[PDB]
UniProtKB/Swiss-Prot annotation, chains A, B:
Domain HhH: 20-35
GO biological process, one term: negative regulation of type I interferon production
Modified residues (N-acetylmethionine): M1
Record organism: Homo sapiens (Human)
Gene name of the encoded protein: BANF1
Tissue distribution of the protein: Widely expressed. Expressed in colon, brain, heart, kidney, liver, lung, ovary, pancreas, placenta, prostate, skeletal muscle, small intestine, spleen and testis. Not detected in thymus and peripheral blood leukocytes.
Protein name per the record: Barrier-to-autointegration factor
Length: 89, 89
């Protein structure tokens, strides 16, 4: 129910160079697969969200097909990345 | 010598949904080729800059091979996109 404090902390201050696993919805195991995919930092992943014009269906299929994230974990990344943009873009 | 007022105006306020041709260094003819390439808005182009980890050589070759921009026009987009990130990312 309550997103971990990271969700509010992430949309409360710049993302700087924090690691991908810092994004809400991405756990240490999942952050590792994206890292092997060339996404060693969160701003490279945010770029993907920007390239998908916030298409939620395209984003969710991209993350799931890219690492195998579940429907629950994709929802946290969508609202988490979408809310950061609302404050920083 | 003096970048047009757009350069300072762009890094002085959010980019919102302004058209790609709004980025400094991209003229109306060049903005049109990127638009045919699927970049109808500036935030989709900024995403590409984020995906290239600000690699200036990779970015310049990408824009030139993508539309044919000259060495002068690529310099304006690099410093223009890079400075916006310094203020908004």
């Amino acid at each position: 129910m309550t997103t971990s404090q990271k969700h509010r902390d992430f949309v409360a201050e710049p993302m700087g160079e924090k690691p991908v696993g810092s994004l809400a919805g991405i756990g240490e195991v999942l952050g590792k697969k994206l890292e092997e995919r060339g996404f060693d930092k969160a701003y490279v992943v945010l770029g993907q969200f920007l390239v998908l014009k916030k298409d939620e269906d395209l984003f969710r299929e991209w993350l799931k097909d890219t690492c195998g994230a579940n429907a629950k974990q994709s929802r946290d990344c969508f609202g988490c990345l979408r809310e950061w943009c609302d404050a920083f873009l």
